[PDB]
Nucleic acid binder design. Structure first.
Lengths: 46, 48, 200, 187
RNA sequence: GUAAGCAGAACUGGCGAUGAGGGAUGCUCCUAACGCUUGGUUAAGGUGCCAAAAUGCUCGCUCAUCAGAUACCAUAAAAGGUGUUGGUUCAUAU
RNA sequence: AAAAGUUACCACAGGGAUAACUGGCUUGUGGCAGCCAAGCGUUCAUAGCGACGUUGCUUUUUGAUCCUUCGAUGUCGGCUCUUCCUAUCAUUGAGACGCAGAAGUCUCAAAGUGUCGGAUUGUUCACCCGCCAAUAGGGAACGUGAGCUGGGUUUAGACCGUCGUGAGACAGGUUAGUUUUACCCUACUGAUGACUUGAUACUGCGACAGUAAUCCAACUUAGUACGAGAGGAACAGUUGGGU
RNA sequence: GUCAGAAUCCAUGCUGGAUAUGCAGUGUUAUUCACCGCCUCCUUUGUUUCAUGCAAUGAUACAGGCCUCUGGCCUGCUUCUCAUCAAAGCCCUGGGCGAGAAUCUCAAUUUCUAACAUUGGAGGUGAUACAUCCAUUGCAGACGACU
């Protein structure tokens, strides 16, 4: 029960790419508009 | 990337949170200075 | 019964009419370059041809469209398809014909060589005037071919390059045909009248 | 179909005309328009007594015969351009809300505020060869003046398009801006 | 029978028992029926390329923001159009 | 020939020469769209309608048929999951009105995005309670059982009613009743990997394929426009919410 | 002949690119007889979808163009160059010298082009490295792979 029941209709007599399957998750290359609050210094009181 | 911690800042938005003190989650990213080395030209061709 | 290479200028040319000539010559064993493929023409208006290219993008393998009809946006790559459309390309002989063909949207290399013209497959000849036509460079840049304005720049650059070559040659076409008129006098008067029978 | 057809155009005095190829420069005192006619199959050629411009087509079918008189009307407009200009007067209309209109008169652009009680501001830049005077002393009027017709009369029409009502019956709400009169300035 | 690649008859010819060339593809359509073959000529059907042969010659019509394109055959109608090309017949150039 | 029944306890030889599913031809029936103009529409055939007639389209209804399948293509419905169509319910941009405003009705480009929570029934349909921008209609072997479920239908047990002298029968009702196998090929999803004017290392280019955002509400605009009055908008701006 | 114009379309951005058996730039290129390059000179073989001059560089228009431009030209690469005199041979800096060539007996492909790779020689200049297993890691992981 941790799975899809119906992959596909009979025709096309072929599994379509749009249906979701089992496989890799994470390690995907991926954002935009994330605000910088503070630029700091390593050289105390940061 | 390092780890993330929350910070407190005063909102400046008339939202109901105007002039109030909001906690926010915040990632620290460690960035020691990047040393410049080379330089690369690029011709623009009809291929790319 | 044929030359080593035959470079085609493809401006003024109609797309199918060109391709059908070019196909049969590849089968006869002639090796061909096509050049300035962006300027090649098609009958019908721009809107009409783009509506026909949109019917082509609608086609795809529904299972996995990675696999299916590759929609090729570049003018060089578009002409290449319609030549392959006029060849039995699954058979081994058909494949050999494509191998001969080289298509470019003008590089280095063959600016230095002459470009010929197929006269039957030509717009000023064929399309009865008023009847609206469309350039392939426009049709391709409508459908996501990015490199319109480079092929503007590079051509406009190497036209100035070629007009510098022209005025050297045009000066030393004068210079030979000046020295011809001396040489035609000094050799004896029988053989001057001999050449004016046969044109030279 | 039809073997020959030729209408001729009278050139007025303070103008010159230079038809090389199909393309026709018209220089007068005020400015100058150039315009191309490389659609039409037609032989333009001016005369020995050079205040007349004949124009002819052989073998004209009845659709393409109708492009002989379209040439004449466009070239006639280019003459009364470079002499006299083309003023298009437009008048504002409204019921309740008085519509408030400003001008960067050299540029030129027309911001239109408070159209039908609205807060969206509506800038309309004109085409390169036309200006916009606010007409003094007559209340509520814009005068559009330039040499070309098609540049001016677009630029008039673009203002009409911008200031258009939606989502309401157009017969009651007549709030707009409309061309009053086509004319010239100089006479 | 509303009709059906539906059911039932009459005359002749086919398919079944039958390939070959054409109709892209098809048991029944077209040409034409077959011993192994060399040369010549046609049939149906075709001649831009796939494809052997015409980007042949000559005269009209058509521009389609879903043109059209070859019998059986792989659908289209009533009703419209000041889109264009001709015709028929009245009325003062329209 | 000299001759009654019954079998759901059933058996055998066969049959796609022959029914019950899909598919195919057909489209009466169902569904959808045109043409003409008697009248309706205070007045006015045509904003919106449209009798008496008449021309089409569709295969989402149901027949008609028996071409395929009887040495078996696993017969309803739900759940899950994907995609496609447009004959568009909502959302976008228009046009028309018997359009003052608000609210609508009609039509064009439109399938980009969206179409819900429950009570009763096995239901498909249906009918209610509610929400919502809207709760449009369909296809893909009446999608989808080596995907599940087994409530229904359709074995054997048993009950009632009607029919039969009886065994038994019922498109009459009722309860109890087994849902088998992938490790093969392809497809799809992920994983390594030989080789190409040398090896090996780093930085790149981007043909081509896939694509992503989309709806609502409040505050001001404004009790303004418009209206005899009741009622009552919109754009720009600000702030949130749903999926 | 133009113009405005949409929840549309195509780009852009985003994901892949062992989705083009695609393409570019840069680093280092085998401890000194030991292999290995690059550039000439000249020989062994073996590849080619295809050697016999398998030849020729303005850019446009077509109800117009080009210039050697007070003139001349267009109506086709239908042209314009190239092709000789002894051998696909031998001698003199690219042109030029001479010489009884046949009985190759009536034709037999006119065996030698081109670049690409390769076997072994001459002379000129050069170079003295990495990857995998292994152990370790855990930003990764069914096993490979990846860090």
């Amino acid at each position: 029960l941790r799975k899809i029941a119906c992959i596909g209709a009979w025709h096309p007599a072929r599994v379509q790419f749009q249906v979701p399957r089992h496989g890799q998750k994470g390690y995907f290359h991926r954002e935009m508009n994330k605000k910088v609050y503070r630029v700091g210094n390593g050289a105390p009181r940061n | 990337k390092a780890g993330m911690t929350h910070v407190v800042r005063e909102l400046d938005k008339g939202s109901k949170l105007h002039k109030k003190e909001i906690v926010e989650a915040v990632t620290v990213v460690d960035t020691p200075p990047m040393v410049c080395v080379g330089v690369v030209g690029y011709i623009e061709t009809p291929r790319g | 019964t044929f030359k080593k290479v035959v470079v085609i200028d493809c401006q003024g040319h109609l797309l199918g009419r060109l391709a059908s000539v070019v196909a049969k010559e590849l089968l006869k064993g002639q090796q061909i370059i096509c050049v300035r493929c962006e300027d090649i023409n098609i009958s019908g208006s721009l809107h009409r041809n783009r509506l026909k290219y949109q019917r082509f993008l609608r086609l795809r393998m529904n299972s996995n469209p990675r696999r299916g009809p590759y929609h090729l946006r570049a003018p060089s790559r578009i002409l290449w398809r319609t030549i392959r459309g006029m060849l039995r390309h699954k058979v081994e002989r058909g494949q050999k014909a494509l191998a001969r063909l080289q298509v470019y949207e003008v590089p280095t290399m063959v600016e230095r060589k002459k470009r010929m013209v197929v006269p039957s497959a030509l717009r000023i000849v064929r399309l009865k005037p008023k009847r609206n036509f469309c350039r392939l460079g426009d049709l391709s840049s409508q459908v996501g071919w990015s490199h319109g304005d480079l092929v503007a720049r590079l051509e406009e650059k190497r036209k100035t390059r070629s007009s510098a070559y022209y005025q050297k040659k045009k000066e030393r076409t004068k210079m030979q045909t000046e020295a011809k008129q001396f040489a035609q006098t000094t050799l004896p008067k029988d053989q001057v009248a001999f050449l004016q029978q046969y044109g030279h | 179909k039809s073997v020959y057809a030729c209408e001729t155009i009278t050139i007025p005095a303070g103008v010159t005309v230079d038809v090389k190829s199909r393309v026709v420069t018209v220089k007068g005192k005020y400015g100058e328009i150039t315009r191309a006619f490389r659609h039409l199959p037609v032989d333009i050629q001016k005369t020995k007594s050079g205040n007349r411009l004949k124009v002819e087509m052989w073998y004209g079918t009845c659709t393409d015969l109708s492009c002989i008189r379209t040439l004449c009307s466009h070239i006639k407009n280019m003459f009364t351009g470079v002499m006299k200009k083309f003023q298009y007067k437009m008048r504002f209309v409204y019921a309740h809300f008085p519509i408030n209109v400003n001008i960067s008169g050299n540029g030129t652009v027309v911001e239109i505020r408070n159209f039908l009680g609205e807060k969206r501001v509506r800038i309309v830049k004109m085409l390169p060869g036309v200006k916009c005077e606010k007409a003094t002393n007559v209340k509520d009027e814009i005068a559009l003046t330039g040499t070309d017709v098609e540049l001016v009369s677009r630029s008039a029409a673009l203002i009409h398009q911008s200031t258009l009502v939606r989502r309401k019956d157009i017969r009651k709400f007549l709030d707009g801006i409309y061309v009053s009169e086509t004319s010239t300035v100089e006479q």
